[PDB]
Design a protein around this ligand. Structure first.
Ligand code: ATM
Ligand code: ATM
Ligand code: MG
Ligand code: MG
Ligand code: MG
Ligand code: MG
Lengths: 194, 194
């Protein structure tokens, strides 16, 4: 009866693409890289793997490093928008994020990042899961085009959040985008209310 | 269409109650303690708080310490039962656990513990969340008597897993218990299948 909205973290709240590129270039200044305008497909490591053998493993080593997740910059408007959204009447917001395989730093730093930008009281709103389809909600705002898992008919509508890797993608109607946090996210939420 | 079962971690897979008591007694050998047969109510810290002022904070310091979660022993039969359950046809198992407030070690060690006892491939089955009601499934096996959150009508049936703190509790019918992993968990699952 409160509208429930799942908001993804990497590529929606946290600038994974830009943080990765900067750190990759700083660590591997003699390697070729992929400019953001040229990113295609969800998996960074796969595109880097195509660019030259060995580069996939080098890419992976950036996000496996300590402080990678913690030092991500918020995307413009993201912190303000989610704080406003959570404050709305009849609206519950959860941050729904999928950790990487190597778990030494990533879960911890994701909690630390949410504490930093949203405060201790928001920590209760975090859901860490590899499968978003088993999380029930009205909406999922997420930059990954294809979201699948154990539940063949998730309860949420997936609204595709624009990112460099999906900006050229034609979606199957009636699939819907949120173009950035400057875009009219309130209209999207309202479209789902009784 | 596959049956989905959420299995709680602390007090269902991992022996939180026994690990806590042992470590509390080792660290604070001059303090009064609560024998397991005398545990009542979900919150350890609250019962310890009643036993004497200051003891709540001492209790908390045990599970906030590094290696507390990682060093928990599995409950008897738990690892074998969950491995068998996951291997069943038309049956998906997720481990659904709620981290403590202090997040330095707990998320990380929970992943490390699941890797230790269930293997790397099981890490994909973990859901960390403070709110279990937003996780959709057929069953939730969990030792906490009262499970509430943002979803007033969760999709799962909650089957109460016996623990020292709930063993005397009379439940409102048609609520159901799993008494230990030696008990007939297959019968409970089968009762929910088409
Ligand atoms: O779907 P979600 O929650 O945004 O992110 C999942 C997770 O994928 C990891 N990743 C990302 C890329 C681009 C890649 O090539 N390889 C990966 O393993 C990082 C991302 N966030 N985290 N943790
Ligand atoms: O409900 P769940 O997933 O088993 O555990 C929640 C979480 O509560 C923490 N806890 C437990 C007691 C008994 C207490 O007094 N105070 C707490 O903060 C530990 C438990 N597991 N974890 N992380
Ligand atoms: Mg994302
Ligand atoms: Mg609200
Ligand atoms: Mg429990
Ligand atoms: Mg199975």
């Amino acid at each position: 009866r409160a509208l429930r909205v799942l908001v993804n973290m990497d590529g929606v709240l946290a600038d994974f693409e830009g943080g990765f590129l900067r750190k990759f270039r700083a660590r591997f200044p003699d390697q070729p890289f992929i400019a953001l305008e040229d990113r295609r497909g969800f998996w960074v490591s796969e595109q880097y793997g195509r660019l030259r053998p060995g580069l996939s493993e080098k890419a992976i080593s950036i996000w496996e490093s300590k402080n990678f997740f913690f030092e991500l910059e918020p995307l413009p408007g993201a912190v303000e928008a989610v704080k406003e959204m959570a404050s709305l009447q009849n609206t519950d917001v959860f941050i729904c994020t999928s950790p990487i395989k190597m778990f030494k730093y990533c879960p911890y730093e994701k909690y630390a990042w949410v504490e930093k930008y949203f405060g201790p009281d928001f920590l209760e709103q975090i859901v860490l899961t590899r499968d978003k389809t088993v999380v029930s909600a009205d909406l999922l705002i997420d930059d990954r085009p294809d979201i699948t898992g154990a539940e063949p008919t998730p309860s949420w509508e997936h609204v595709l959040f624009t990112a460099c890797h999906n900006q050229h993608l034609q979606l199957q109607p009636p699939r819907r985008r949120l173009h950035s946090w400057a875009d009219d996210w309130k209209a999207i939420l309202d479209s789902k209310r009784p």
